[PDB]
Design a protein around this ligand. Structure first.
Ligand SMILES: Nc1nc2c(ncn2[C@@H]2O[C@H](COP(=O)(O)OP(=O)(O)OP(=O)(O)O)[C@@H](O)[C@H]2O)c(=O)[nH]1
Ligand SMILES: [Mg+2]
Lengths: 159, 232, 123, 204
RNA sequence: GUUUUCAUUAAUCAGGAACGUAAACUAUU
RNA sequence: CUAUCAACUUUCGACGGCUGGGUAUUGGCCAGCCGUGGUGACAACGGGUAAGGGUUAGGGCUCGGAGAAGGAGCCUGAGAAACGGCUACUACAUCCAAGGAAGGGCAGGCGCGCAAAUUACCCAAUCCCGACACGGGGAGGUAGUGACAAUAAAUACUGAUACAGGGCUCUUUCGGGUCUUGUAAUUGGAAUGAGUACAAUUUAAAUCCCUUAACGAGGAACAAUUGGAGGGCAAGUCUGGUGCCAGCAGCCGCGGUAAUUCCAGCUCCAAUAGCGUAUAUUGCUCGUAGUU
């Protein structure tokens, strides 16, 4: 349908994704989380199952940084979306932190091993960066934007 | 050649020693009430790494078990066998814990010299002589004439003679070595006969838990008198 | 008791929980994160290589057949650093635990308002 | 129902055109060609196969070599020389084909030429890819990469899922005995040749 | 209709039993 | 589980007790003597063949008859009625100088004429057997294949200048809507992993992994695919017919193959290391068993 095609094209364009399999992957994990939230809303308030399982779900989503720290209700967990998940991806986080000029530049950098998340370099652009780990995204020490060797085209030109 | 899970739960093996486990060779103590010397050396103490290293320890006269040199690797050493290593100058003793597993205890020569062994049976041997059989299958010729069944004996271990004995008593503290309440150091406070098989004792700990264990599974350790050093 | 044990350690018990330095629980250049259960296993493998310091075979074909089949019969998923457990029998124990865990000054005012004739009338 | 569906699909797979057999009761020796580019070791495989079968160390084996391999059937090995006239002469003759590929060097035009000459003239029953010069390798990751890419290109060339043997070394100037033993396990037990129309009408 | 009696005798039909030139416009309501 | 199984045992003694034999020992286990039993509607007996226990949050984990070509008999040893041997008979089958002599398994391929996972390496760990530290192990571990699935994601990123004036859209169409878009243009920057690869390391020896010096990108390449829809074309070919039209179509044209540089790489849609196709599909009354 044209609505599905235009929606998936807006996702693939707005966040520099490769195909629609990544969109369907995110929509599947989002539907799993939202199904768990609906099943926890089935029960009444102050049931211990709903209390502890909903607190676990909300603390998990706030810790992985999707759900905002302001709103912490299970209705907002139902109101979650795939734009929030693709915003929590690593590639859009490199683009928004401004190490790269565009989202396709960010995917290129993460593929050819320039950025690192915390200590180790990250080869995958779909790395779900958590909220505590959002700040420690920077260029690695072996990268010419970080330091070390001046690099490849630089070496061929400076010879 | 049993598997690591089919090995009993009281000589411990981690996720490390392969899927298989050594079987104890036939000897004084039983099969399911046993710690082999290889599990004592390289799986409990970790003075060794491999089977060949354990063999290179055992074959030279460096490990003595109950005061005699034990050469073969899977020699059974179940309960209260003093294990003297002279190059390290240590003597270990095997006791249990409150959960039901084997425990090792480091000690020197003064408590290493004697063994507290529970009498299995008294009889008249050949030559018209009374003899005494312990749980270590030690038979002592010409014993003291009051040492009856279920009494324990301080064996000399340099000559093997009797030195002292502790009587089966309601009011003497005891150690459990079997059953569903295994390894619980407490005091024998009651004993019920049940003639016709399988009599019991009722026993409480130091802090008021009564339970009924069988007179086979009991083991007398001392009235107060901890003649072996239970670990503090 | 899985969801209940994490509520005590983070909200109830006043003891700080060790967090890893950020890049350490990344498996293969980002291909997975090590969840706090899978990380705690990884020290247990490592803490067994200094005791008598014989090396290990990095899994085998018969363990990988088992543990990767455990994903086939479980509803767990690891969306980020955390685990997201299914709401089946793990949710019923939370109800199943909590049910066994739950198992002469007046007279003076009346005589003090019966003495005075009256205050007034309706305004 | 699905068992009936798979049974019907296999019953339609078993079918062919009803051509005439024209094989006698005492059949002639089946003809094994050893085809390949120059320098690949066709004569070396010939020496090694005849030592496996008849235990005779031939210092210079030429011509067709007939060999008893079973109590019912027997073979004959002919090594095609490096000339196209001999290759086109024997492609209409061959009963089973031993098609040699030169390992690290990859495929050659003589190999592809004989494959499509054979396919255009008449396809026999059994063609076995034999990949040699594997010992002229230094990295055993490059070795399995070359085996995988040569297997897939050969599968595209003749059919999917063929037999591609890997003959590693040259020990005594001959070949390894275990490798040529499994090669002869494959070319010893045999099935009747394909009913080709040219061979079933014209006497050669 | 009666200023009449026994008080479940009853309801339904497998099996079975008695009676035997044509067609052609069509809990209440 | 069953009464479309009510009698069963005494039909190899069926229940005893006495006496012995044999067994490692008890025992109708077997032999002599006699007594009258034994089980069963509380389900024996017969019939159907579809042959679990423990560890308890959970799942997991652990344990669980007959034959060595066919009957018959024998031998060793602590332990076998080993099937390891012998003997005879029976049935195959081999060598021979024709007098004689040795022998009885699994694995693999084909199972159409058309097909698809190694005849891989070692006891190095855990374990077992021996005169015994050394000798020997078909458990075990190591490696190879794999688009049946499943997992992550390369095939490019970013500027400047020059030039063109159109690009896009629709309900309503010889009409309306919106304002920056291009180009096979000219140039410049960087980034680099696939691959190549010295080593060291891993390991029984290797491989993989982790470390890693050195190379490694300009398209005419380090060469993305599978389907669907549509336009444009000749001194070409075919068919129809009240001239020039229409249709099907067209690798095929005058020459020319070292000749040609052409729509120069046609346009759009979908999925994209995956994708398509086929088929299956998703006459009336009375009256008994019975029923209410
Ligand atoms: N290392 C290595 N050398 C090989 C292999 N096969 C063949 N050779 C050598 O290559 C040489 C080629 O000899 P052949 O095999 O007779 O060549 P051929 O093509 O069979 O015979 P011609 O067609 O007459 O050349 C021999 O000297 C072999 O030793 C191989 O698998 N490995
Ligand atoms: Mg030749």
């Amino acid at each position: 349908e044209a609505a599905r095609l235009d929606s998936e094209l807006k996702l693939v364009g707005e966040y520099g994704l490769r195909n629609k399999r990544e969109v369907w992957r995110v929509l599947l994990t989002l539907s799993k989380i939202r199904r768990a939230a609906r099943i926890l809303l089935t029960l009444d308030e102050k049931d211990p199952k709903r209390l502890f399982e909903g607190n676990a779900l909300i603390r998990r989503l706030v810790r992985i940084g999707v759900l905002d720290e302001s709103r912490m209700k299970l209705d907002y967990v139902l109101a979650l979306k795939a734009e929030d998940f693709l915003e929590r991806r690593l590639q859009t986080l490199v683009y928004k932190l401004g190490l790269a000029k565009s989202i396709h530049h960010a995917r290129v950098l993460i593929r050819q091993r320039h950025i690192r998340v915390g200590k180790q370099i990250v080869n995958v652009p779909s790395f779900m960066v958590r909220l505590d780990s959002q700040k420690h995204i920077d260029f690695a020490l072996t990268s010419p934007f970080g330091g070390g060797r001046p690099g490849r085209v630089r070496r061929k030109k400076a010879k | 050649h049993q598997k690591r899970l089919s090995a009993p739960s009281h000589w411990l093996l981690d996720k490390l020693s392969g899927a298989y486990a050594p079987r104890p060779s036939t000897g004084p103590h039983k099969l399911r009430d046993c710690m082999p010397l290889i599990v004592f050396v390289r799986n409990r103490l970790k003075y060794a790494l491999n089977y060949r290293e354990t063999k290179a320890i055992m074959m030279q006269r460096l490990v003595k078990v109950d005061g005699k040199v034990r050469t073969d690797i899977t020699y059974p050493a179940g309960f209260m066998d003093v294990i003297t290593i002279e190059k390290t100058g240590e003597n270990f003793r095997l006791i249990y814990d409150t959960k039901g597993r084997f425990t090792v205890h480091r000690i020197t020569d003064e408590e290493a010299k004697y063994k507290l062994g529970k009498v299995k049976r008294v009889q008249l041997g050949r030559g018209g002589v009374p003899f005494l059989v312990t749980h270590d299958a030690r038979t002592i010729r010409y014993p003291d004439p009051l040492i009856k069944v279920n009494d324990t004996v301080k064996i000399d271990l340099e000559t093997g003679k009797i030195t002292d004995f502790i009587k089966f008593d309601t009011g003497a503290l005891a150690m459990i070595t079997g059953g569903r309440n295994m390894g619980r150091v407490g005091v024998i406070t009651h004993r019920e006969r049940h003639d016709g098989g399988f009599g019991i004792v009722h026993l409480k700990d130091a802090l008021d838990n009564t339970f009924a264990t069988r007179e086979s599974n009991v083991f007398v350790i001392g009235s107060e008198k901890p003649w072996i050093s239970l670990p503090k | 008791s899985a969801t209940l044990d994490e509520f005590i350690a983070d909200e109830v018990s006043t003891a700080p929980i060790a967090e890893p330095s950020i890049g350490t629980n990344i498996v293969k250049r980002g291909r997975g994160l090590k969840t706090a259960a899978e990380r705690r296993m990884e020290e247990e493998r490592r803490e067994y290589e200094e005791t008598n310091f014989v090396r290990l075979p990095k899994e085998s074909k018969k363990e990988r057949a088992k543990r990767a089949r455990m994903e086939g019969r479980s509803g767990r998923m690891n969306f980020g650093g955390e685990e997201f457990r299914e709401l089946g029998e793990g949710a019923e124990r939370i109800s199943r635990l909590t049910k066994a865990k739950s198992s002469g000054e007046r007279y003076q005012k009346r005589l003090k308002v019966l003495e005075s004739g009256r205050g007034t009338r309706g305004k | 129902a699905r068992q009936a569906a798979r049974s019907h699909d296999i019953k339609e797979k078993r079918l062919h055109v009803p051509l005439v057999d024209r094989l006698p009761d005492e059949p002639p020796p089946r003809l094994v060609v050893i085809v390949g580019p120059p320098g690949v070791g066709k004569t070396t495989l010939l020496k090694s196969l005849v030592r496996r079968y008849t235990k005779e160390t031939m210092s210079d084996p030429v011509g067709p070599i007939t060999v008893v391999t079973s109590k019912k059937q027997r073979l004959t090995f002919i090594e095609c020389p490096n000339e196209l006239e001999a290759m086109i002469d024997m492609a209409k003759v061959a009963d089973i084909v031993l098609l040699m590929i030169d390992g690290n060097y990859g495929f050659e035009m003589e190999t592809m030429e004989f494959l499509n000459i054979l396919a255009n003239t008449g396809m026999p029953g059994n063609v076995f890819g034999i990949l040699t010069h594997l010992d002229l390798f230094k990295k055993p990751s490059a070795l399995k990469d070359a085996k995988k890419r040569l297997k897939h290109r050969l599968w595209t060339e003749l059919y999917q899922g063929a037999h591609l043997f890997y003959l590693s070394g040259v020990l005594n100037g001959r070949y390894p005995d275990r490798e040529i033993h499994n090669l002869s396990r494959f070319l010893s037990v045999m099935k009747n040749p394909r009913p080709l129309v040219w061979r079933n009408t014209h006497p050669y």
